[PDB]
Design a binder for this molecule. Structure first.
Ligand SMILES: [Cl-]
Ligand SMILES: [Mg+2]
Ligand SMILES: [Mg+2]
Ligand SMILES: [Mg+2]
Lengths: 243, 244, 250, 241, 235, 195, 231, 240, 111
């Protein structure tokens, strides 16, 4: 034993226990989701209201990269911010050299390689976040989810955090009941519902809903936050479904 | 991080000793015995090769005695590979001195330089020391014929006669007994071989298990000659002294 | 990041042993048998091509490697370590000799350079020793033919004949009885094949044995004509057919 | 017992971290196979999409390293992509410096040397992957070269990698024992792919749908992967005889 | 082993806390600030009678208006004094003025936590920095290896510190004269010292606006010791 | 600076160096000693560009004094001259070379012989019976070529030097304000206080 | 236990103990309170002394004309982080002729603290900060933890016994938020809030430290007889 | 680079590496320093376990740093060479930049500073050496004698000893050396230095080295016969 | 060839009274024979009751003033809001100017 004390050490299983311990920090965090729609993507996140003293709508969790990519994550919030800062550097250097905005699959690998690099040495700690991200590019809509190991895949729907099982089950129903696809405005409504349904796992404290989206028709392929009437419409739809 | 796996090669024990230096000296004590004897008219270097084989090519082999320049040679005791790293450094240092001052390097200066390098590995860098002890045999116009030794601690001292490697305790007692100040090279040759013959762990001392060298003013007029003995020449001097 | 292992991983133990070098030698012991024999007019080096799978093409894996036109090498121990040492040995023959003196290094000095590289892996920070013992055969104008062994410690010794790896103890005994100072190259090849058969279990033929020589100059292998002084490489790898021919007269 | 944590020798002369990297290779529970035709080199690999939420088009362990070279990986995807990116960079650098396309075997050697360094240098860990490089080389013809965490590499007539590699290996061994040749004597690559799939079915004892497989094909001057519909056409031809 | 910059479960840096234990083993140093000046005094503590006590330099000048006394591993203080002198002197170059005592102390304390794996460990010495400037007047600071500095009306550091600090608690008042402060340092030093206090094993110093920083002669201190003995025998 | 002469006689080396320091149209000093004692039996005179001269001389002096302390032994004039030459040959290909010419006069106590070395700023070393730097030799070499013997006494060397100086004072347009003369022999280095 | 030797090591439950130990240093530190209205933002700090001869350690540091913070924990770490803020506020002014947004100031502190939690050799910061400021979007109050987490709040408190003041502010939320155009009443609410964290000792003239920033009010610190008004 | 912190504090406030360096000094051969009215004498022990030694070429225990200052030591011999070399370089550097030779106090302060630097620098261990530095300042006739140690502290001494059995010879010096009237002549100073070593040395043959330093760069090392005459006279007076 | 310097004209004037001081300057900015601005302020309130004007090459003048204003700001941070005396400011400005001895600020400064 002692194989779990140092990062980048293979156990006799062939496992990196430090990365698996980083996953525990992710599982401890709040619920965040991603939904791929007809011409874009929708992101949503659970924000726990620890106290009345928290200013509503101020502690924003979802982050934009470039102008067409949205990022959300669960786990250690600072680790996510560090990863997004890198993502912004990667996106900037890509656009600087190649002119065109970074494609989503290209961007996904830039993060993937960076996260994976933090599993190669004992002088660094793995990332304590799973990151759901995506957007619209020349080839259409893309949704990705990235784990502490550096592993990532493309998704129809994605979920992570404490309420991931509940969320995943709800996402699986949408995939089955909508093979032809889901609209952007529908996906926002469904996203709100899923976060509310996933809140049963964090039911002690009340929460605040935060949604964003990229859509070719609704947002011109740019990342925007869901605000005002459209946000309230999604909250009302979500509240109606739980009752 | 990496700290976990660091042996810390450059630290004191509670008793004020350097662990790695002491353990390096323990390694050297299992190496083949090397002897140096200084006479009025020259210096002798004798050394024992370790358990050889009949299929070893002796005439082209060199594990003990090395040439630093025309005036200075060394006998090695310890890790041969480590010694060659230091030997090449010493050869370069001697040439640097010759280029700078247009004079052959004084023996002590060369010895001090190598000893300072060894010292550095005991105080900084986190690396293991060189597991090597040298006997330096040399000549210059200041002090004449000189014998020195250096060990992994980087400490060096001058000698009239000295041994390094295995059985130095026994060897030094025998040298202290039969050595005299008015001694000559031919007598010193005999003393060196007789001392090895009594201290050796082998059954009998033969030509194929020895390396031998002399530094003599026995060169035509005021100058010094280095003689690295050939296998046949070692065989002859063994018969002459009456060992085989 | 940064390589933070700036300290030695090989250190002296209380008994004076350098553990990692001893353990490297143990890895060499487990390795497949290889040998070398020096003749009056040449040198031979040989080893078994231990194929990991019959689907694998064992011709693509070369255990015997050309370092210079007149110097060759074979090993026992860890194959990947040998491969990188050959790459470095080839390069150091140019950078530290040929680009200075306009000619290829003599065997003993190339061996010295390889030995230096292996010693540094025994003392430098954040590395383990190489897990191989090399047998380097070669020829040069002023020293003639020669055969050297190089160990993980960096120590090297010249040999008339020797063997390393799995069945080295038995093989060295076999060579002591057969070797003399009047051997011709063909006699040395014959003795090499006899010695190697004892350590091999399975198939024993030109396809499972790798054997090369340092002998006469090969002008047919030079690739050009017109310069009298350039007479071609002395290193030659024997073909599968050439080995089988000598196994009939065995 | 820190000799099992970093890449230094154990008393037995072993490198445990290298051995444990070999075990990580099978973590994906995927089996791959590679064979050579007359004019082509084919590589097939099992494809497993357990989650319905995954986009199956993005799930892949086959990589297009250069126009001529393809690479299939056996091991976790992060290390797989790490190796893939490096091989792509190396293949491109080679062409720029030396004025011709990097051969399959040379790339394999280069990646194997990089792997060797990780077994010798302490601060770098080995990658828990086995890399199978395939191409139709302009000098050597159809080529298969495989690299592992020990830094070992060798050319192959055919090969297999994964948990059930032995069953596939023996199946292929027995075929080449009959035919007494170093390749699949077939003109079209389509039929060489059919051979590869058929012999994997026989060896593993499982049937395959179009979404269960992943296929890569190397021809002269290009390497390409097959779509699900291209594989379906391949599965239909197998069933009809 | 363990990191040099490691936190304990209680939220303290191990190495900083351990360096404080080294300072407790050091010789006593006392400082008293008044409106007429600041007095600095130290226990010399010679290890042998053959040691020429006048070479023991535990009270030191930083600038004309700033003095300094030390306690603990005194060898570690030399680079701190050097930095302080350079800082005081450099500020005079850049701003054509004397440097504030607090600013000087802050500059010295910035070095404190510059250790890791920069220097390999914290300083094993505490400093009493006394001085005067036009803005805040006569001041006394206590600079620790934690990087923290407190201003004090009076302060004792070293082996007899907690005993001396309790005595300074009762004796100090805002109307103390310079002469009264001098005797008070001598009184408390004599109380906590192992050997008998005299002009050779103890040293006084002060900083005034007029005369600046001055280390007292052994003849001058001897008279103050004799003046102390008589006033204690007076009641 | 301007004129530096050197002459090796039977049992000593004599160095004569001008006293004047000039900055443009003004003579700043008329009693400047353009020499440094490198070791008890080795003296180096020097001339070249301002600053470089003294910086180089004192740098050499410090290195030789360091060697003496380390080994408890005085280097031979030949060893010193070789060390100096290497420093100048190193300097000439540097970013800003030392613009200094030197004469090294020493008495070798081992060989019991005086020795004079001439080294210019390029690192051009030559052992000589007599030598000069700059425009000095142009006037003096004809007299030295005529009158010089290797068996000359120190007094005869000084008389020949006075003649060389008299010729300089007659035909040189520049006033160099006389010379400081120093003798290097077995007993060490001394200055001739009347010349 | 075995996983608290350095900052680069997760525990089996996914915890970073060195960061948690750095968090513990804040709890040992003296109490400090932060609160704001729509027009002003206020810091109130209880300063701590070594003994009766000693001075009371300063808790509040100015970063710019429109921004500053109060500290709780290792003071030297606050000096490092406040110096960084001073430079960032200053970079924004010199380059962009722009006053640094308080939200962006929080993001910069978060990222600076994070680098110290993921790399070997270094250590986390051992201090908590309460940043107040007035920018183009009005008054702001931030809470900084050395884990990297930064939070925008109406009010809060950190340090020893800070739970008492935090509960008070949670009750008073609706009242003190409405205190617009009245600095003295907002400070009164802050002084009354910090009083809920006191035991044995009370607020004296050299004990209390107050700071304020607002619409037409530069960041200013009040100490000594200047805070006697609020005792 | 190797940055490891080797010299660190322990729970009880000790730096063990520095304290273990003092143990290396305790093992070293005895060295003694005595200053008279117009001179300073440095005495050194030579262990007689090593015979067949060449005393011409063997590194002497007392080293000249400049023409007017000397340095002797106790502890690791190899370590001492590094300090001596640094000291010699600094002595020439001081003459080169300030046009004056170093004072004895300055040279001591430099050497002590080097020793201290090696107690809080990464990747290095402390010097296992304590030194006695003696001499006369330029144009001064007051004798100077200083001591340094691995921690980096230094101080001035009327008389002092370091190395093995230094406790015993310090005991002797404390009762025999009078401050009000120090050794008025060279003879009296050398005699007292030899006497002090005879408490520890064993045989008074080739085991005692003596070096006398006088004002104005007048340094000389005594020979075996000259020292043997002191050894003879001391014991003949003792037989009473 | 690129010339990094220019001449923006202008003239400034400082007079010291018994208990007051004035710093005047024209508001014209020019290149060659053209007018850039008829009102471009050249004299600035730098804080601590100090006024400053760097006349000559406007780009260098603006940079110096900007740096000195910054120096005043950091003097307050580092020295407990102490007022920067005029003599201390002058010495500070010397070091700002000489920090570019080998690529000077082409301005004549008055405070
Ligand atoms: Cl390579
Ligand atoms: Mg090796
Ligand atoms: Mg490794
Ligand atoms: Mg010339």
């Amino acid at each position: 034993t002692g194989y779990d004390l140092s990062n980048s050490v293979f156990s006799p299983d062939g496992r990196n226990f430090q990365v698996e311990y980083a996953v525990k920090a992710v599982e401890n965090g709040t619920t965040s989701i991603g939904i791929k729609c007809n011409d874009g993507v929708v992101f949503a996140v659970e924000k726990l209201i620890t106290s009345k003293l928290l200013v509503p709508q101020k502690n924003v969790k979802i982050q934009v990269v470039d102008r067409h990519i949205g990022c959300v994550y669960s786990g250690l919030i600072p680790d996510g911010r560090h990863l997004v800062n890198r993502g912004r550097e990667e996106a900037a250097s890509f656009k600087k050299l190649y002119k065109t905005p970074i494609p989503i699959p290209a961007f996904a690998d830039r993060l993937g390689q960076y996260v994976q690099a933090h599993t190669l040495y004992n002088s660094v700690r793995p990332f304590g976040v799973s990151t759901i991200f995506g957007g619209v590019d020349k080839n259409g809509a893309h949704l990705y989810m990235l784990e502490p190991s550096g592993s990532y895949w493309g998704y129809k729907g994605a979920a992570t955090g404490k309420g991931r099982q509940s969320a995943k089950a709800e996402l699986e129903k949408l995939v089955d009941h909508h093979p032809e696809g889901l609209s952007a405005r529908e996906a926002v409504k469904q996203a709100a519902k899923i976060i509310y349904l996933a809140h049963e796992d964090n039911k002690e404290k009340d929460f605040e809903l935060e949604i964003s989206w990229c859509s070719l028709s609704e947002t011109n392929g740019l990342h925007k936050f869901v605000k005002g009437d459209l946000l309230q419409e999604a909250i009302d739809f979500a509240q109606k479904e739980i009752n | 991080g990496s700290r976990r796996y660091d042996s810390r090669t450059t630290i004191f024990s509670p008793e004020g000793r350097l662990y790695q230096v002491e353990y390096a000296l323990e390694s050297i004590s299992h190496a083949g015995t090397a002897i140096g004897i200084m006479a009025s008219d020259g210096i002798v270097l004798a050394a024992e090769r370790k358990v050889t084989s009949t299929l070893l090519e002796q005439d082209t082999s060199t594990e003990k005695l090395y040439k630093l320049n025309d005036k200075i040679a060394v006998a090695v005791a310890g890790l041969t590979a480590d010694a060659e790293i230091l030997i090449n450094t010493a050869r370069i240092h001697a040439q640097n001195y010759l280029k700078t001052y247009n004079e052959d390097i004084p023996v002590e200066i060369l010895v001090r330089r190598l000893s300072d390098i060894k010292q550095g590995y005991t105080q900084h860098g986190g690396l293991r020391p060189f597991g090597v002890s040298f006997i330096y045999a040399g000549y210059d116009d200041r002090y004449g014929y000189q014998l020195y030794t250096s060990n992994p601690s980087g400490n060096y001292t001058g000698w009239k006669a000295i041994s390094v490697g295995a059985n130095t305790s026994a060897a030094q007692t025998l040298l202290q007994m039969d050595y005299k100040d008015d001694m000559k090279v031919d007598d010193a040759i005999e003393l060196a071989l007789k001392t090895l013959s009594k201290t050796t762990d082998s059954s009998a001392l033969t030509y194929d298990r020895l390396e031998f060298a002399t530094i003599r003013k026995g060169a035509n007029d005021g100058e010094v000659y280095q003689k690295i003995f050939k296998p046949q020449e070692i065989k002859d001097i063994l018969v002459k002294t009456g060992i085989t | 990041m940064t390589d933070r292992y700036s300290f030695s991983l090989t250190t002296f133990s209380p008994s004076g042993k350098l553990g990692q070098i001893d353990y490297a030698l143990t890895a060499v012991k487990q390795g497949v048998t290889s040998l070398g024999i020096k003749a009056t007019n040449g040198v031979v080096i040989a080893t078994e091509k231990k194929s990991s799978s019959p689907l694998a093409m064992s011709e693509t894996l070369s255990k015997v490697s050309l370092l210079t036109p007149d110097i060759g090498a074979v090993y026992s121990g860890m194959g990947p370590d040998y491969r990188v040492l050959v790459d470095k040995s080839r390069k150091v023959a140019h950078t530290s000799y040929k680009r200075i003196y306009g000619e290829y290094p003599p065997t003993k000095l190339l061996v010295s350079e390889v030995a230096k590289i292996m010693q540094e892996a025994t003392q430098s920070g954040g590395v383990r020793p190489f897990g191989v013992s090399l047998l380097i055969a070669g020829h040069d104008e002023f020293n003639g033919f020669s055969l050297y062994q190089v160990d993980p410690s960096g120590s090297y010794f010249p040999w008339k004949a020797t063997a390393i790896g799995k069945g080295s103890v038995a093989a060295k005994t076999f060579l002591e009885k057969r070797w003399n100072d009047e051997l011709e190259l063909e006699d040395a090849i014959h003795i090499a094949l006899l010695t190697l058969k004892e350590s091999v279990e399975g198939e024993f033929n030109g396809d499972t044995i790798e054997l090369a020589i340092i002998g006469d100059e090969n002008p047919d292998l030079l690739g050009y004509t017109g310069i009298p002084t350039d007479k071609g490489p002395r290193f030659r790898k024997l073909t599968s057919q050439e080995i089988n021919d000598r196994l009939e007269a065995l | 017992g820190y000799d099992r944590h970093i890449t230094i020798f154990s008393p037995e002369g072993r490198l445990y971290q290298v051995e444990y990297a070999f075990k990580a290779t099978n973590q994906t529970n995927i089996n791959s196979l590679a064979v050579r035709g007359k004019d082509c080199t084919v590589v097939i690999s099992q494809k497993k999409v357990p989650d319905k939420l995954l986009d199956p088009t993005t799930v892949s362990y086959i990589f297009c390293i250069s126009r001529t070279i393809g690479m299939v990986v056996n091991g976790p995807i992060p290390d797989a992509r790490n190796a893939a990116l490096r091989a792509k960079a190396e293949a491109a650098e080679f062409r720029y410096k030396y004025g011709y396309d990097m051969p399959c075997d040379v790339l394999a050697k280069r990646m194997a040397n990089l792997s060797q360094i990780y077994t010798q240098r302490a601060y770098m860990r080995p990658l828990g992957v086995i890399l199978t490089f395939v191409s139709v080389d302009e000098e050597l013809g159809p080529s298969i070269y495989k690299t592992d965490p020990a830094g070992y590499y060798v050319g192959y007539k055919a090969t297999a990698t994964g948990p059930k590699q032995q069953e596939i290996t023996t199946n292929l061994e027995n075929h080449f024992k009959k035919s007494k040749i170093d390749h699949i004597n077939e003109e079209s690559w389509e039929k060489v792919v059919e051979f590869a799939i058929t012999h994997m079915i026989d060896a593993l004892g499982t049937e395959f749908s179009k979404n269960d497989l992943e296929v890569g094909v190397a021809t002269k001057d290009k390497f390409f992967t097959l779509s699900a519909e291209n594989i379906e056409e391949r599965l239909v031809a197998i069933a009809e005889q | 082993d363990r990191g040099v910059s490691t936190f304990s479960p209680e939220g303290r840096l191990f190495q900083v806390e351990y360096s404080l234990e080294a300072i407790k083993l050091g010789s006593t140093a006392i400082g008293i600030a008044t409106k007429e000046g600041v007095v600095l005094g130290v226990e010399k503590r010679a290890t042998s009678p053959l040691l020429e006590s006048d070479s023991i330099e535990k009270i030191v000048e930083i600038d004309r208006h700033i003095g300094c006394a030390m306690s603990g591993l005194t060898a570690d203080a030399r680079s701190m004094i050097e930095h302080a002198r350079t800082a005081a002197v450099t500020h005079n170059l850049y701003y054509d003025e004397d440097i504030n005592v607090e600013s000087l102390t802050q500059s010295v304390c910035d070095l404190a936590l510059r250790f890791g794996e920069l220097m390999s460990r914290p300083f094993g010495v505490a400093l009493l920095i006394a001085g005067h400037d036009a803005d805040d007047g006569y001041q006394l600071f206590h600079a620790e290896p934690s990087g923290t500095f407190y201003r004090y009306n009076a302060k004792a550091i070293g082996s007899g510190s907690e005993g001396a600090q309790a005595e300074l608690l009762n004796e100090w008042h805002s109307s103390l004269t310079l002469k009264e402060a001098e005797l008070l340092v001598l009184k408390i030093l004599k109380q906590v010292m192992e050997e008998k206090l005299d002009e050779n094993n103890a040293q006084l110093s002060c900083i005034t606006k007029q005369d600046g920083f001055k280390i007292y002669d052994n003849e001058k201190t001897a008279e103050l010791i004799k003046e102390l003995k008589e006033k204690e025998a007076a009641e | 600076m301007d004129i530096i002469l050197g002459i090796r006689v039977q049992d000593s080396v004599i160095l004569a160096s001008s006293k004047a320091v000039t900055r443009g149209i003004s003579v700043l000093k008329d009693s400047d000693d353009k020499t440094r004692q490198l070791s008890p039996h080795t003296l180096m005179s020097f001339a070249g560009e301002a600053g470089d001269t003294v910086q180089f001389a004192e740098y050499i002096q410090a290195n030789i004094q360091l060697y003496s302390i380390r080994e408890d032994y005085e280097l031979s004039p030949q060893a010193v001259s070789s060390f100096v030459r290497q420093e100048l040959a190193k300097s000439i290909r540097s970013r800003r070379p030392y613009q200094v010419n030197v004469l090294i006069g020493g008495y070798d106590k081992k060989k019991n012989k005086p020795e004079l070395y001439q080294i210019d700023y390029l690192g051009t070393k030559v052992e000589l019976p007599y030598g000069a730097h700059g425009y000095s030799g142009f006037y003096t070499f004809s007299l030295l070529d005529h009158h010089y013997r290797p068996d000359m006494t120190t007094e005869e060397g000084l008389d020949l030097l006075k003649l060389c100086v008299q010729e300089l004072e007659k035909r040189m347009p520049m006033d160099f304000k006389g010379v400081i003369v120093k003798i290097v022999d077995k007993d060490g280095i001394r200055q001739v206080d009347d010349f | 236990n075995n996983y608290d030797g350095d900052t680069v090591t997760f525990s089996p439950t996914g915890r970073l103990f060195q960061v948690e130990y750095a968090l513990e240093a804040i709890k040992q530190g003296s109490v400090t309170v932060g609160l704001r209205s729509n027009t002003h933002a206020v810091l109130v700090a209880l300063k701590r002394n070594a003994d009766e001869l000693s001075s009371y350690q300063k808790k509040i540091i100015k970063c710019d004309e429109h921004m500053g913070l109060s500290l709780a924990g290792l003071a030297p770490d606050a000096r490092v982080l406040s110096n960084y803020l001073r430079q960032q506020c200053n970079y924004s002014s010199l380059v962009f002729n722009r006053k640094l947004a308080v939200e962006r100031a929080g993001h910069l502190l978060c990222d600076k603290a994070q680098k110290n939690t993921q790399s070997y050799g270094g250590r986390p910061y051992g201090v908590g900060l309460l940043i107040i400021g007035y920018d183009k979007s009005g008054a702001h109050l931030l809470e900084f933890q050395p884990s990297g987490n930064v939070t925008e709040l109406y009010g809060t408190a950190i340090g020893a016994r800070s739970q008492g003041a935090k509960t008070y502010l949670e009750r008073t939320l609706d009242t003190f938020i409405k205190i617009d155009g009245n600095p003295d009443e907002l400070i009164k609410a802050g002084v009354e809030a910090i009083s809920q964290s006191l035991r044995d000792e009370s607020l004296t003239v050299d004990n209390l430290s107050i700071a304020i920033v607002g619409k037409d009010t530069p960041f200013t610190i009040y100490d000594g007889e200047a805070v006697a008004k609020y005792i | 680079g190797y940055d490891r912190a080797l010299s660190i504090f322990s729970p009880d406030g000790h730096i063990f590496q520095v304290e273990y360096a003092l143990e290396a000094v305790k093992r070293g051969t005895c060295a003694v320093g005595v200053k008279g009215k117009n001179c300073v004498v440095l005495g050194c022990e030579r262990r007689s376990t090593l015979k067949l030694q060449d005393t011409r070429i063997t590194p002497s225990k007392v080293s000249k740093i400049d023409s007017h200052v000397v340095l002797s030591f106790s502890g690791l011999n190899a370590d001492s060479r590094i300090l001596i070399e640094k000291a010699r370089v600094e002595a020439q550097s001081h003459r080169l930049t300030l046009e004056d030779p170093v004072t004895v106090e300055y040279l001591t302060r430099y050497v002590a500073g080097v020793q201290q630097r090696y107690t809080q620098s990464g990747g290095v261990r402390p010097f296992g050496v304590s030194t006695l530095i003696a001499g006369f300042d330029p144009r001064d006739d007051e004798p100077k004698l200083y001591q340094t140690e691995p921690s980096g502290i230094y101080s001035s001494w009327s008389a002092q000893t370091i190395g093995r059995n230094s406790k015993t010879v310090r005991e002797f010096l404390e009762k025999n050396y009078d401050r009000k009237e120090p050794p008025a002549t060279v003879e009296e100073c050398v005699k007292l230095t030899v006497r002090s070593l005879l408490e520890v040395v064993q045989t008074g043959a080739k085991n005692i080295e003596i070096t006398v330093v006088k004002p104005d760069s007048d340094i000389v090392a005594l020979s075996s016969e000259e020292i043997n005459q002191y050894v003879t006279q001391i014991e003949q007076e003792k037989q009473e | 060839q690129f010339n990094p310097y220019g001449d923006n004209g202008g003239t400034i004037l400082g007079i010291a009274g018994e208990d007051f001081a004035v710093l005047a300057g024209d508001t014209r900015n020019i290149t060659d024979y053209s007018i850039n601005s008829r009102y471009e302020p050249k004299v600035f309130d730098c804080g601590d009751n100090i006024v400053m004007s760097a006349n000559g090459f406007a780009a260098d003048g603006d940079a110096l003033v900007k740096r000195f204003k910054n120096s005043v700001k950091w003097y307050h941070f580092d020295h407990n809001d102490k007022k920067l005396s005029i003599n201390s400011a002058a010495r500070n400005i010397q070091h700002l100017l000489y920090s570019r001895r080998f690529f000077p600020y082409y301005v004549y400064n008055i405070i």
